[PDB]
Amino acid sequence: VRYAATEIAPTKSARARGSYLRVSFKNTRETAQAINGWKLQRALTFLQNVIDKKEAVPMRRYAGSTGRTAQGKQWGVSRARWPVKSAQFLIGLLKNAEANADAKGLDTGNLIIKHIQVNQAPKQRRPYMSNPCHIELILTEAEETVQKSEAVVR
């Protein structure tokens, strides 16, 4: 039969969650998609350089025509925007996962963002409806490589 790709060891990963967060789902999803797959320190610098104004976040699926500058040249997207609150929430969850990895015993210099998922939260019943979200990110260690030994003769 076919065997699914087994999960990485819980001693090599660190998970952070945030539920019923009062930030917009679309902006948070686009911000999470921008930082998906990166190294941890690179994501830290990008979110801190998008909290204070230098760097842009491109939008691809939930893309609204707001700004058209050169900061989208590196992403190849002509539509770029700068959500702020989603960056603060992602920053808070990233330091939460850093604290979890430090407590668990992981090397915090080789942490990469394995996966980050933004789901929809229940809508706030006040016709104007708020769009909260859940965020679940899992950081892992960089994959370690061991040199083989030459086979023996018999």
Add this chain to the structure above:
Amino acid sequence: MVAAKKHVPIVKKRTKRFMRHQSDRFKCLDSAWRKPKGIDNRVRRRFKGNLAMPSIGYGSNKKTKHMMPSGHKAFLVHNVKDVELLLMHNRTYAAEIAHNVSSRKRIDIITRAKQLGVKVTNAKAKVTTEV
């Protein structure tokens, strides 16, 4: 020699199911067949390139109706007394243990059926082999 009976070859006139018209487009429409009742419905008028409707000409041979590919007919069993009813029909019927039968009763049915020479379709149910 233990198998099903000698039977005429099993011929299925149609293997696909008859899907309801426009049931692939709407999620509110189940795929179970409903006869179209509209006057201009081209499925009902039997235009070319449309869905066929179920007809009595699609029926199966009476000598191979209700018959499994092995040649047996399915006989639902809930206990050991039910497989004992197949003592004289071991070559025509196969035992199908019901879905709500417990594990030990399933072991009892499988053991008796093997002794009677009756095939069990779901003998790989919640049991396992101990050495």
Add this chain to the structure above:
Amino acid sequence: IWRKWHVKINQGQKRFATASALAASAVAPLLMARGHQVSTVPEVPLVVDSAA
């Protein structure tokens, strides 16, 4: 509430049905076909003495 809940049956047909049921009760294959365990019963109209 003024639905027809009760059924009027002729008393002759009811007495016919009661006599037919009494006659059927004296037949033992009908007793086992109804679902009664009478395989140790010595006679199907099982008469016991009144002194018991």
Add this chain to the structure above:
Amino acid sequence: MKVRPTVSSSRRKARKAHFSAPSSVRRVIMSAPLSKELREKYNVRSIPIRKGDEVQIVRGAHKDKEGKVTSVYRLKYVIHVERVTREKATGQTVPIGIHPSNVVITKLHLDKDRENILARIKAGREQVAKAKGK
């Protein structure tokens, strides 16, 4: 089968009467059987339980445990036996609520009114024994 027209076999009314009962009715409901030795001694089968009785638990995960009843919580329909306790998360030892039907009274808290109850039950049982004998 019930015959008296005042009795009700309604499940709804029975459940309402059980779960909305006064404290004295709950006392009557919260009864426990006597031990074998006490049953031959007092000719009484069961008595309403009270604080100060020494019981043995005969059902549940705390079977064969003995102890003195230190609380009769009629509102929660449970008794609290001595040393049959638990541990909370913080480490506090809370009592475990055991139904009085799950215990057997090995020693009674004998006062005057309890002796009157035992005498009345014994008198009724022996007068029915006389009625059965002749």
Add this chain to the structure above:
Amino acid sequence: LSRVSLARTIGNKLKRQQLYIQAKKANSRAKHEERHRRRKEEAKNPELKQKRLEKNQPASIDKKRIWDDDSLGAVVDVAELKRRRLELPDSLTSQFPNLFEPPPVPKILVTTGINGTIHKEAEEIASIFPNATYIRRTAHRYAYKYSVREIAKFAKNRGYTALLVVQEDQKRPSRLVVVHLNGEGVPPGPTLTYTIRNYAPGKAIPGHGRATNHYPELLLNNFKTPLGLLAAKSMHILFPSKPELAGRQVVTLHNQRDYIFFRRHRYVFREARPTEKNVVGADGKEMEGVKGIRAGLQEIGPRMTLKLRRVDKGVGRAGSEGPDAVKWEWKAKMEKKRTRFNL
């Protein structure tokens, strides 16, 4: 709200939900205020933090374990009873003199069930053990059905040390039967039946490796019960005693709360990157001697989980004869308490 359920006191769902929400707000704010104040006083006085940490320890099921107050089923610690006797193993070596004068080099025969379909899985499980050959049990569908006792006698006559039977469920490995064939005039020995539950081949593991022909070294961890010592010895005899250390390959059987996690890695002793921490020792940090030295590990073998289910005297139930037919049998009622472990 730690003693009272609002669902059992308030008959209105919405009122109870509002009350619970207000309770969560108040409790979270008060707990954060209390912890901030506590942290400020730890900053003022850095001494009572150490007493707080050494007094308020987190709970663990391993420390809450219930022992007994030694014969193959007594939940006792052999090392601690030994240290009691120094300051009542003998029953194990009396019952199993073949397992407990060094054992010879092992030759392993690995097979399957009767109409087995796990050929690749059994071949990989055989490739775990050095000097192991996989032979199918039935050839075609309608051939002779050899029994485990017959195969055990056949492999005993051909010099094999042990026989492994891998039994499947839904085309996946489910049970492992280990029979010790012994040698000379000794009959075939004890049979240990485990359940394989979480099986994944090396390919399934992300970032994996290919094993070499070097003999691995055994890490049999956390076996204290005499049953656990028997299981550890049964796993020890299957492998050669002298490992070829040129190929750094380690086979780990770690027992935790009756579950034996089986892994296989290859390792390298490297210098620590400057963001890595020193390896913390057991019951006290700063592993003396290897500060700045760390072991890099790469999975080259299958991840499986085992649980010892039966120990038999002979080759299975049919083969064990006398009143000492079954040595040990797992029952679910023995795991009624979550702090009771058989190992």
Add this chain to the structure above:
Amino acid sequence: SDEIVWQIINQQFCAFKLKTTKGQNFCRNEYSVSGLCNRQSCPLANSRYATVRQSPKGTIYLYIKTIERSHMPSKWWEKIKLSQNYQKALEQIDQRLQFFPKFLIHKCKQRLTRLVQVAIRMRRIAAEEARLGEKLVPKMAPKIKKREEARERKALAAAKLERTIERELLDRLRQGAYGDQPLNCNPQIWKKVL
């Protein structure tokens, strides 16, 4: 009144009837010579009847029912022991069921044949399971399976497998378990340890 009880059984209700959706009805009655609900095989609607049944001892008997004991449900059947010799048992069935309907005779011979074949098959099967030693046992119950899954998850979380392996390998490296000039590690690594 064989016909009248047959009409009542067949067209209204019988407690021994198993109605299947596959084109055949079955008779749950133990004295039915073929487990099929039809007119000739009914043990109730036929006053004279004959069947063949096997005792738990293994002795096979022929049961005969007459009309003159039909009001005697405790005395319905006379039981005649059939021989272990198959041909002699066939002739016994022929001799006792003389002048019976040919359907009953034919079905009695067929039932005796099937019972002897089942006995031989049972002996062969019992020998094979005695030789092999296999036995079907139930799988784990869903509550026990859920318990093992949850506690294995907690044990895997508490195991800390890779950290334990790395710690034990470093411990083996400290105490000289690999010996002087270890083949495992580089010479500079062994120099740093000392």
Add this chain to the structure above:
Amino acid sequence: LIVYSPEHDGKELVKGFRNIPGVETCPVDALNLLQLAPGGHLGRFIVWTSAAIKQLDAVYESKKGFFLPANIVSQADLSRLINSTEIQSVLRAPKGEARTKRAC
């Protein structure tokens, strides 16, 4: 179903059969079709008394406007009617068998 005569057996036997699950009691003068054919299925098991049989002879002559019905068939055994010398003698020779061999 226990059928008794209340004049000759009394009604004290009703009390002794009440708690036994399944068993029912009915006087012979007030027989109930809902008890003689439960579910509409004929053939209830009945334990009579001797006085029940004697008054069962008695009470079917006491119903005004009702007499015991005459059947439209005298001999209900169809095998006795067809397989009898009376009918088999006048029967013409059979025109075929139960199974017809296929001609072409």
Add this chain to the structure above:
RNA sequence: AAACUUUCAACAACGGAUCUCUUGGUUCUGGCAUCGAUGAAGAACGCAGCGAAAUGCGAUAAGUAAUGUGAAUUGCAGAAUUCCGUGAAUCAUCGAAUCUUU
């Protein structure tokens, strides 16, 4: 190349269908006849340690007396309050009383 769109599978969401339950409704049947100027129905204000709702009660205020039972009440806090006793109880019964403004 990458990005986007569509379909399928696993997992995670949203939502509250289905199943099972029920101190509720609804319909029928039986016994009985009892509000108020000796202040009714209804409205308001108050009475508890923490009372938000509901309920009970009226400055004798989650009640007093009398009778009966016989050892509690209980979410937390308190009692030197009661256990061979005219005696606990958010107990039951109920014949005596108190009964604010309308």
Add this chain to the structure above:
RNA sequence: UGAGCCCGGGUCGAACGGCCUCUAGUGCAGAUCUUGGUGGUAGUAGCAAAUAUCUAGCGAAACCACAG
């Protein structure tokens, strides 16, 4: 043939099914259908009751068989 029915795997936790009869508030794709939930428009229009441009934060509605 079909409306449908039976079995396997997972989840789940207290009841349920076949057959013969009886009974009915008994079978949905639509009714500008009722109630609830959820979308494209759309992070768009706009910062408006409630809660002259760029950028943060907030954020609809008409319309919608499927597409030009």
Add this chain to the structure above:
RNA sequence: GAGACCGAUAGCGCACAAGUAGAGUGAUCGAAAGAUGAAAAGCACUUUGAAAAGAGGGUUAAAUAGCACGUGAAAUUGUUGAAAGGGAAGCGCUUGUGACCAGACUUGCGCCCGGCGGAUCAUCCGGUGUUCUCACCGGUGCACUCCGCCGGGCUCAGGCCAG
């Protein structure tokens, strides 16, 4: 006191704060809203931080039962994997490719020797129940007969597809 009634969009508007919340100057109008667990055992403690939030860890049979709580559908959404496409998608018939899944006849009987053990074998004995001639026990033995079991020998029958 009951029922061939309804079962939380049903049944009274109201199973729960219900003529309540709320609307209207007023007469009046009038909702939505049930289910943790057997037991709160309602998550101690360590550690992020300002959250109706996490990670370890613990209770429990179970926490993917955590007062958002039995089960947990669809519409709609996110992460991962695979495939296809940019002048509509969707459907019917028929092969092909890739991935995944299943696993075909359930695969037997009869003869001929040798050994062993039982019996329906012995016109053997005793007992029990009976439909009174059939069954069932107990004890004897293998001259005959019949069954099995073990070791050899032989023949036959076997499911599907091609030429």
